Amino acid sequence: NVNLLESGGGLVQPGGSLNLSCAASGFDFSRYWMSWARQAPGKGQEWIGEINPGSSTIKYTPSLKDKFIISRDNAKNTLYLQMSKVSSEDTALYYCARYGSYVYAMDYWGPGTSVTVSSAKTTAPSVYPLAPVCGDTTGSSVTLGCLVKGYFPEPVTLTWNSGSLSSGVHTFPAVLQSDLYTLSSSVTVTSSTWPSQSITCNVAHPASSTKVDKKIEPRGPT
Amino acid sequence: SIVMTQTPKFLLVSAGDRITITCKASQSVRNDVAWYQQKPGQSPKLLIYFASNRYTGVPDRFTGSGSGTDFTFTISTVQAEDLAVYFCQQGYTSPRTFGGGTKLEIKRADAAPTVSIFPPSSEQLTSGGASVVCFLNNFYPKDINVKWKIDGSERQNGVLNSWTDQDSKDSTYSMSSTLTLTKDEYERHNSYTCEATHKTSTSPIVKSFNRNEC
Ligand SMILES: *[C@@H]1O[C@H](CO[C@@H]2O[C@@H](C)[C@@H](O)[C@@H](O)[C@@H]2O)[C@@H](O[C@@H]2O[C@H](CO)[C@@H](O[C@@H]3O[C@H](CO[C@H]4O[C@H](CO)[C@@H](O)[C@H](O)[C@@H]4O[C@@H]4O[C@H](CO)[C@@H](O)[C@H](O)[C@H]4NC(C)=O)[C@@H](O)[C@H](O[C@H]4O[C@H](CO)[C@@H](O)[C@H](O)[C@@H]4O[C@@H]4O[C@H](CO)[C@@H](O[C@@H]5O[C@H](CO)[C@H](O)[C@H](O)[C@H]5O)[C@H](O)[C@H]4NC(C)=O)[C@@H]3O)[C@H](O)[C@H]2NC(C)=O)[C@H](O)[C@H]1NC(C)=O
Ligand SMILES: [Cl-]
């Protein structure tokens, strides 16, 4: 049961260095070619490089061949990407990928690990509960929200009732302004549900070790 | 390095229709072409390899064809779940370069947005800021305009908008609009309004509150 899981991403200052890891399971890692790719914000996928099972062949895209180094540890089932001299164009989601048997096609991609290259300071979010006033409803349902402001870098993870509530949820892409992100999420439930069944927004920001629960409480008729 | 030129960059199709994407290589790449599908929030999945072979478990409606420099990818009957970015790749020589991608959007029946407005939370007001939030949810088509008014006067400075990707389940879009003031400016006015203009109605959808009144 094939699995890849990248780790090691996060904020790195321009000109700095960062090592990414890719943990593999569910197949004989020592028999497969492996590769890295990345997707920068708003751009398509970009192939970074590849490495054969015995590490005797390692190839890169020319623009990256002097910044990045690919390596692998077959004994530990791990693939690595050594990033150095990074710049703003290296900000991206980085993916590790297996090549299919005897083909140069990428038949399994990991979930990705986010890297941000910036000199802006790490900042913790403020988390604000949003409830309607004056009894505002849309028909038979009510919409509540959660506003996450003033943080850096991405990512923030937002859930509702620790993930138990996923239907009727819209979580919007984070938007950057003056080196701080805003993110918001709305949840729509039936008027009967709330507030008798509590609704809580959970926000996690590992870069600032922030973990916040904000219960939504009424400020108008229910 | 070989350039893979992928067209069109965008596709808007109704469910049930056929689509064809084209990838042209700057030099011959034999049959060493792969096609991938990347759904919103997910990693890419391999659909086609060696130009025209379906990868294990890929459904029949996906096919590819071509050789040399000219390659196509076809969905015979598009389904709503096929909303994704599709991209080609040549694997003939290194670097194994990708095409620029095609974003496939799904056509559906018109839907007016569901609009909700929220005054600043008291927690934020304590810290000296004041954000007013308007959600405009589950609408189609995607083109929509939001205007903020404060005591009847349009406000543009301080507005931050975010849009979801098209939903794979109901094929709608949603949008969030946040107007951020200082607490002092917020308390200088009483009426806050978010007005949505969308092709479904001749009239704007107007959601409003007064700081002092219900
Ligand atoms: C990302 O990963 C990579 C790879 O790691 C592996 O893969 C990953 C995925 C993991 O699995 C990981 O577990 C794996 O290991 C990491 O790279 C490693 O990084 C460490 C540092 O953190 C390096 O360790 C250093 O190695 C130096 C020797 O390196 C040379 O030889 C190595 C073995 O062959 C070779 O691998 C290196 O590439 C390098 O090779 C040379 O390279 C140069 C230029 O590139 C060439 O010109 C040479 O020709 C070439 N030679 C050869 C034979 O190839 C050690 O010297 C160094 O020790 C010093 O530093 C540590 C602190 O880091 C101290 O604790 C030590 O005590 C020692 O300190 C030094 O002490 C001397 C005194 O004896 C001082 O000299 C004095 O200095 C004065 C001026 O200040 C005066 O000049 C005075 O006269 C003079 O005597 C030194 O100043 C002092 N230096 C310091 C800094 O304090 C250390 O052991 C690994 O080599 C490197 N491995 C690879 C493969 O790259 C990477 O870190 C990681 N990054 C991140 C962000 O995670
Ligand atoms: Cl590429």
Author numbering:
A (entry chain H): 15 to 236
B (entry chain L): 25 to 238
Which sentences from the paper describe this structure?
The parasite inhibitory anti-PfCyRPA c12 mAb binds tightly to PfCyRPA with a Kd of ca. 1 nM as determined by surface plasmon resonance analysis. This mAb recognizes PfCyRPA independent of its glycosylation, as revealed by Western blot analyses. Because of these favorable properties, we chose c12 for epitope mapping by determining the structure of a PfCyRPA/c12 complex. In a first step, we determined the crystal structure of c12 in isolation. We obtained three different crystal forms containing a total of four crystallographically independent Fab molecules. The four c12 molecules superimpose onto their variable VHVL di-domains with an average rmsd of 0.35 Å, which reveals a minor spread of the elbow angles between 133.1° and 135.8°. The high structural congruence indicates that the CDR conformations are genuine and not dominated by crystal contacts. Third, consistent with the similar conformations of the CDR loops in the individual c12 Fab structures there are negligible conformational changes in the c12 CDR loops when bound to PfCyRPA.
Sequencing and annotation of the P. falciparum genome has supported the identification of new blood-stage vaccine candidate antigens, among which the P. falciparum Cysteine-Rich Protective Antigen (PfCyRPA) has a number of noteworthy properties. PfCyRPA is part of a multi-protein complex including also the PfRH5-interacting protein PfRipr and the reticulocyte binding-like homologous protein PfRH5, which binds to the erythrocyte receptor basigin. Moreover, PfCyRPA-specific monoclonal antibodies (mAb) inhibit parasite growth both in vitro and in vivo by blocking merozoite invasion. Here, we describe the crystal structure of the promising vaccine candidate PfCyRPA alone and in complex with the antigen-binding fragment (Fab) of the parasite growth inhibitory mAb c12.
